[PDB]
Design a protein around this nucleic acid. Structure first.
Ligand SMILES: [Mg+2]
Ligand SMILES: [Mg+2]
Ligand SMILES: [Mg+2]
Ligand SMILES: [Mg+2]
Ligand SMILES: [Mg+2]
Ligand SMILES: [Mg+2]
Ligand SMILES: [Mg+2]
Ligand SMILES: [Mg+2]
Ligand SMILES: [Mg+2]
Ligand SMILES: [Mg+2]
Ligand SMILES: [Mg+2]
Ligand SMILES: [Mg+2]
Ligand SMILES: [Mg+2]
Ligand SMILES: [Mg+2]
Ligand SMILES: [Mg+2]
Ligand SMILES: [Mg+2]
Ligand SMILES: [Mg+2]
Ligand SMILES: [Mg+2]
Ligand SMILES: [Mg+2]
Ligand SMILES: [Mg+2]
Ligand SMILES: [Mg+2]
Ligand SMILES: [Mg+2]
Ligand SMILES: [Mg+2]
Ligand SMILES: [Mg+2]
Ligand SMILES: [Mg+2]
Ligand SMILES: [Mg+2]
Ligand SMILES: [Mg+2]
Ligand SMILES: [Mg+2]
Lengths: 78, 161, 93, 121
RNA sequence: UCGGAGAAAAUCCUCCGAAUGAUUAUAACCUAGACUUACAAGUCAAAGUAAAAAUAUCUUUGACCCAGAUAUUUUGAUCAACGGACCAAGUUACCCUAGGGAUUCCUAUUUAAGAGUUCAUAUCGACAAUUAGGGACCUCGUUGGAUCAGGACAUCCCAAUGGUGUAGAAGCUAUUAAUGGUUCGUUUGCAACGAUUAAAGUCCUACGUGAUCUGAGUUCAGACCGGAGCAAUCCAGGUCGGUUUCUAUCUAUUUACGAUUUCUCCCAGUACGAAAGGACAAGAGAAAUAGAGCCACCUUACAAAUAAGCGCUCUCAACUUAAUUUAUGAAUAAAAUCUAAAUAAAAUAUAUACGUACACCCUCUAACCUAGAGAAGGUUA
RNA sequence: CUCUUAUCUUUAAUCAGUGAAAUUGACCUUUCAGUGAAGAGGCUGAAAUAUAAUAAUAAGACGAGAAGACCCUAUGGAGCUUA
RNA sequence: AACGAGCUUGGUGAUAGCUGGUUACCCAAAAAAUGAAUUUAAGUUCAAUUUUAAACUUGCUAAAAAAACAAAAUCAAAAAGUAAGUUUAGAUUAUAGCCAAAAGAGGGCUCUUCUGGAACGGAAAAAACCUUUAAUAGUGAAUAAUUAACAACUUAACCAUUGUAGGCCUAAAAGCAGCCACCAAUAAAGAAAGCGUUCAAGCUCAACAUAAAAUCAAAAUUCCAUAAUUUA
RNA sequence: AUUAAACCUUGUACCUUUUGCAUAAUGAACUAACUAGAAAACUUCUAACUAAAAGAAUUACAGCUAGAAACCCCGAAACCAAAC
């Protein structure tokens, strides 16, 4: 199977896109040490939201109006 | 036995093929590089001296075409000429050109073209040369110089008398 | 067709992306009263603002993060250059 | 055996010509990444599938903003081939509370803080 | 069943052992935390207490039930099919049901030591080359014929050629060509044989082809021998005998051609050759078979006016092309060179340019017909 | 049998009366090459192609019917023999 | 009117780990065909998975040094990107895979390990290759993969004499059977390079002279889309 | 889709199985009617009353009581008893 002309170009185009991806990942704004702890607070709060919803499950309230409203099915014009 | 490659691998091979650098102009079409200084082999310098020696030694130099006669028959001519103390000389023409270009003899260049033989001696037995030439009829004489005087065959015949 | 050319001009590759053609209102009342905002535009405005806030938040955390590491190093530097008491010598100290 | 791959570090050490080609200063590095998914994770190993969801790049051609910090970059290097990384650029500065609702991310990678939909004039 | 060792976490992968004993300073009870593990089973152990005044040292397995032995404590499996039914073998071709299946030497190229008197390649040809194609142990793994054939060329004969260790004639080898042809018997599990032939090709088409036919086997119900088994029975051991039917729904198909080979004669007993022997090409006549027809004769019938063969007659042209061989002639300075140079020719089998045949335009009560299943078609003083 | 032929009867066929069977997913039911399970009317690619009967042929529709053949399975049977 | 053992009724709705079948809509989630035992391998029970509900808290990716090995997984401080996880209660089904690509081991199969796949697009038809985040209505748009690809280049004119048929079993071998060394003349030529050889004479190559050029190249039914070398 | 029934374009019948695969293999001439999931040990949901609940015998260290919520059809060769 000889490889087509169009097939060869499309691979090259993708390779160039990834080649640039190498360049932009080579200049970290922060070093490994400076990174430590800069996002601690946001992470801590996010889990608290996760736990709060998980531990808040409970049955729903029941109202008399729901049960009594069924009688309206026999509502009429006098 | 070749095993078929995955198409993705085959695509990788196709795009990574070697590409040679291409010159804009062919080197042949371009002017040819100048020749470096040449080396004289130990054939022209030694033979150059031989050409110098024969001209210095022999006062008369007469030129005749090579006849491509059998060497077994060249011998008898050489032996016959040796009995008359007249010698034969043969040299490559191309290395003979530079001296003949710049020497006492410069109008003999047309004579020194192609296969040729040289009549060299110390005595002007020019009449006997015809007798030695008459021994073999078909051999012709082209001309040359006798006693340092350049002349043609017809003039040589008159000079012989 | 024309995707790459549009990208070179700074435009969206798809004419349906960001530009007057899509984002502008498609109609208004004859009296001149503006039409209610289109649902797609309202969603697109919401997503764009959400991305704008994220950009602000991450930069502040990183910028606040480097300053924290900056002042921390000063404390380590100060901690090293410390001493106390006194330094006698000889036959008694 | 197909296994996770460790790239030699030399790949991510740029050359002086690279800076000229891509127009990026090795000093004052950019802060935020613009990353879009441009390939599918189908037919890719599960570890690549996992990171794409972690990074938020589930939908293709929809940009995500990420921190240009080493830990994030490590994840991006895993899926480098499935994404396009573009530096986020702020010609008119960071968006403020007033301009937070008037921003627009251009294809060039520039986040403008005023979007008018009018001829430049 | 389990343990040890290699491969290394696979194997019908390769080895060694165990269903142990020896050795004794005799080796308690109780109790944190762990290993291993589907379950069951199997491991290690601090602290405390108690005997003594160092542990046992070598290095494994069988549950529950149920039976024992005792003064509480103990013992019971080649249950080895080793998660173990308390205790049960053969045989079936007389069979049944429920299902699952299946139905190495060639040949072509490359190389070329040696064969060939001499001489690698007339004819062959070691060592090799070709992604070149084809066909545990002793036992044992559908195809003939008939009918009608379609196709391949890797050509057996017919045709055109190159080479020769080709004088002729016989041969050997190569190239091109798929044209039509390629027999009748004896023996009868095919394998040889007899007589011929121009030749008696090699193969593909689910044995090409059993809703076209038929033999043997697959292979059984009966029966015998030989062998095995206490027997019933058995044998990829002999033999004799032994019943598959189908009315066609669909596709497909059911109305012409322009010929092949052999023998004799002539050339000519010539050419060739010392003789022996012995031809080309050109030309003439005969047969055979195949195809297409026909009935004056002959022959067999209807003991009919017809139908048949065993009787009779007729059969042909090639525009254009392959191997190969000539002519002119450049690239290549020639009195070179057949030319995937421009050119002019000759030269297999093929075939359809080219001809034959067909064409007409449609009365039909009915009758008759060498036309016919019906219909159609032909004839009518 | 070489090597088949003729005649007569039965059947056949046309007309009149009566009137079954297996079978049947639906069919508006083609050829070639490819693909594919040895495999194609229905798929891929080329090609062919007014519509319907009547009478014939049996290559295909793994053509239609049987309690057939062969092998394997079941902690399914049964007959027979014993040690 | 089908006897290896009659027929009828009843036991009897015999039993069948086996074949076949098992009737409305919508939404959601989803294994894997792994390990173990079994007269077990056409079955079943347990683990493992999956799932519903509930409780409360860290999980997933990653993970330095550093140990354990020999001289890419196990382990998992800090972080970071992210939203799952553990435990309790209840519950079936499943426990034969298929193909592609890697690494091995038996020697193309047959096994074990690791990754991926199940188009409605593409590769001709095409479960498994490649492009593809679900599901929609629209006579809008930008794109992905995408069976096609563009035969061959030191050797061209002329000549060849002589010491010597040179030592040698060889009849004879003279460059060229044999074996031997391996120099002379000649402006120019091998004590000879291939030929030929009763043996030699004999055919050329190298000698001399004059003579021009300049490494490998991507069989069997009936052919089978049609075609095409240049417009940016 | 179309102005237009057919022409043009797209499109490898259904069920059951086979490994998730159908050009496999079963089953179906067609119509009408008939023709196959059934139980409350534990669990969950909804209520009564509550250190007690239940209309006698039972359970109980928040339980107990009541309700609702569940587990197919056809088919052998055979075996036995009594008649014919
Ligand atoms: Mg246990
Ligand atoms: Mg202790
Ligand atoms: Mg057992
Ligand atoms: Mg066992
Ligand atoms: Mg065990
Ligand atoms: Mg018998
Ligand atoms: Mg034939
Ligand atoms: Mg041939
Ligand atoms: Mg048949
Ligand atoms: Mg008989
Ligand atoms: Mg018939
Ligand atoms: Mg003749
Ligand atoms: Mg009738
Ligand atoms: Mg029709
Ligand atoms: Mg039709
Ligand atoms: Mg076909
Ligand atoms: Mg078709
Ligand atoms: Mg018919
Ligand atoms: Mg048929
Ligand atoms: Mg059948
Ligand atoms: Mg069993
Ligand atoms: Mg009976
Ligand atoms: Mg039953
Ligand atoms: Mg079973
Ligand atoms: Mg057992
Ligand atoms: Mg951590
Ligand atoms: Mg294409
Ligand atoms: Mg079957």
């Amino acid at each position: 199977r000889t490889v087509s002309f169009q097939a060869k170009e499309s691979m090259i185009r993708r390779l160039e896109v990834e080649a640039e991806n190498h360049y932009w990942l080579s200049m970290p704004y922060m070093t490994a040490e400076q990174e430590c702890g800069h996002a601690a607070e946001r992470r801590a709060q996010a889990f608290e939201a996760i736990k709060a919803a998980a531990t808040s499950k409970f049955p729903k309230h029941r109202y008399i109006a729901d049960q009594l409203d069924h009688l309206n099915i026999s509502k009429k014009w006098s | 036995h070749w095993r078929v490659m995955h198409f993705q691998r085959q695509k990788l091979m196709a795009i990574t093929e070697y590409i040679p650098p291409k010159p804009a102009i062919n080197p042949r079409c371009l002017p040819p590089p100048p020749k470096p200084p040449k080396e004289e082999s130990g054939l022209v310098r030694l033979l150059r001296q031989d050409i110098v020696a024969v001209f210095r030694d022999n006062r008369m130099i007469a030129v005749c075409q090579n006849v491509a006669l059998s060497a077994e028959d060249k011998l008898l001519l050489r032996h016959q000429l040796r009995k008359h103390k007249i010698f034969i000389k043969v040299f490559p023409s191309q290395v003979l050109k530079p001296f003949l270009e710049n020497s006492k003899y410069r109008n003999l260049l047309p004579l020194f073209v192609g296969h040729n033989l040289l009549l060299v001696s110390e005595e002007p037995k020019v009449k006997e040369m015809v007798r030695v030439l008459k021994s073999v009829p078909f051999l012709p004489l082209l001309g040359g110089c006798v006693d340092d005087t350049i002349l043609s065959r017809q003039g040589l015949v008159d000079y012989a008398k | 067709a024309g995707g790459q050319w549009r990208l070179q001009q700074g435009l969206a590759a798809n004419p349906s992306g960001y530009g007057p053609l899509t984002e502008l209102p498609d109609w208004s009342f004859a009296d001149g009263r503006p039409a209610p905002p289109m649902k797609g535009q309202l969603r697109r405005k919401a997503q764009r603002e959400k991305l704008a806030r994220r950009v602000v938040l991450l930069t502040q955390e990183m910028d606040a993060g480097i300053q924290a590491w900056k002042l921390r190093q000063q404390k380590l530097q100060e901690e090293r250059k410390k001493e106390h008491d006194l330094k006698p010598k000889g036959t008694l100290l | 055996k197909f296994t996770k791959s460790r790239i030699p570090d030399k790949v991510f050490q740029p050359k002086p010509e690279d800076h000229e080609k891509y127009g990026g200063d090795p000093q004052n590095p950019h802060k935020l990444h613009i990353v879009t998914r441009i390939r599918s994770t189908k037919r890719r190993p599960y570890w690549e599938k996992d990171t794409i969801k972690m990074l938020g790049l589930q939908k293709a051609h929809s940009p995500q903003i990420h921190k240009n910090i080493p830990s994030v970059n490590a994840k991006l290097k895993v899926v480098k081939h499935l994404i396009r990384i573009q530096p986020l650029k702020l010609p008119q500065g960071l968006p403020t509370e007033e301009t937070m609702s008037s921003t627009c991310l251009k294809s060039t990678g520039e986040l403008v803080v005023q979007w008018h939909l009018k001829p430049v004039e």
